[PDB]
Amino acid sequence: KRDLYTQIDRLTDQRDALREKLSAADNFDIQVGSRIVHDALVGKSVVIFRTPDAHDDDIAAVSKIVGQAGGAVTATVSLTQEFVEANSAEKLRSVVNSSILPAGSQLSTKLVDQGSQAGDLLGIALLSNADPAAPTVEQAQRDTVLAALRETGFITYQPRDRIGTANATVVVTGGALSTDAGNQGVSVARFAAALAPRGSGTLLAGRDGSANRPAAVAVTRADADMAAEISTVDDIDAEPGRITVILALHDLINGGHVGHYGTGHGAMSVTVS
Amino acid sequence: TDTIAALIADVAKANQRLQDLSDEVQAEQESVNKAMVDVETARDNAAAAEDDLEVSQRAVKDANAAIAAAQHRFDTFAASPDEIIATVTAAKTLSASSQAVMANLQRARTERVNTESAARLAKQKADKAAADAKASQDAAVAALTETRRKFDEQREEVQRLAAERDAAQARLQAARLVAWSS
């Protein structure tokens, strides 16, 4: 068609109509969010991990929906830039492989990268093993692991005292990574995968663009081992993505079913069935 | 009420209590001896658990040093135009091998840390059993001295009563003779 003016007006009117429908669709989801996740996490606790590129509003939305599900958030641990860049790998492993490991607790000896080892030790400190034979970590023992990782600049956490044990975990990232920040994808994907066996399930949640390499969600989906260990959400920036974090966390705690959700590359569906 | 038959029966009841306290002193002395032995075995176990911990701590110290020594070779190796192209070519050729050497040393180090972790828990359990053994030896020693003081108290009461019975029997035989002589 060579009617360029009438094409611009028609396309502007189509785009504006879809924007209105989309605002209403997102408002529908906010208003029924508590109905969707009703009793999804009753009696259960979640520990939240967040990366430097994660958005405050996503963490707050996940934490609000956890509460709507009848669940509690034990703490929000921020993984510092010193951890995710992976340039302090040996300093990290010298802290993890020290007497800070609670007495009698055993570190995994399979993967020795700093991401896997940090998630393994923080899984011991902050999560409850689905296996009753595994040790129950004391409050003083958990605080020791946390203070050592905070003095060495790997983590930041709220609240600073009396953090309880959690059933499951969410690791929240931002969107797409710049190629120069590619180390952050692998370190956080391995970090998230090592938390999976230490509790009742880990979900790795990212904003739009996280399903593209080199982001953690994409690194997870492309690695057969990690894609089988943790669940992922690639659109935590949107309300359907935030609701799916809780619905897929429910699936992990009750049955251990792993899925890859959202609108991006490698997502098997938008949400759980 | 003040008859010699009643006084004799009073000595017999007091002496039965004294016999019972003597029997408790002997039984509690055996408990102190048994507890004394339990303390020495628990203290030996705690000293053996400290040796297992020291051995595992040394092994951790060695594993950490082997990682540091591998990193020192890789760092010193990295440290002229055609010579610098050759250093980079050699380092890039051996890169994946250096990673595999390091992964092997890191895994070995975690395995030593896990052995030390188990040993730390065994040392804490052995110390708790040694402290619980001492708590029992102390509770048995204190119970023995309490029965020993009740025994000493009863032995003096039995001596007092037997001295009265002996004096009354001596007075009875003397009074019988003064009456019999008249």
Numbering used by the authors:
A (entry chain B): 41 to 313
B (entry chain A): 43 to 121, 137 to 239
Report text from the authors:
D,L-endopeptidase RipA is the major PG hydrolase required for daughter cell separation in Mycobacterium tuberculosis ( Mtb ), as RipA defects severely hinder cell division and increase antibiotic vulnerability. Despite extensive studies, the mechanisms governing Mtb RipA regulation remain controversial and poorly understood. Here, we report an integrative structural and functional analysis of the SteAB system, a regulatory complex that has been shown to modulate cell separation in the model organism Corynebacterium glutamicum ( Cglu ) and is conserved across Mycobacteriales .
Although Mtb SteB was previously proposed to act as a mycobacterial outer membrane copper transporter, the crystal structures of the homodimeric protein, alone and in complex with the RipA coiled-coil (CC) domain, rule out this hypothesis. Instead, the high-affinity SteB-RipA interaction, together with computational and biophysical data, strongly supports the role of SteB as a direct RipA activator that releases enzyme autoinhibition upon complex formation. In addition, crystallographic characterization of the cytoplasmic core of SteA revealed a homodimeric organization harboring a conserved functional pocket similar to the phosphonucleotide-binding site of thiamine pyrophosphokinase. These data, coupled with the in vivo phenotypic analysis of a steAB knockout mutant of Cglu , support a model in which the transmembrane SteAB heterotetramer, driven by cytoplasmic ligand binding, orchestrates the productive periplasmic positioning of RipA, leading to PG hydrolysis activation.
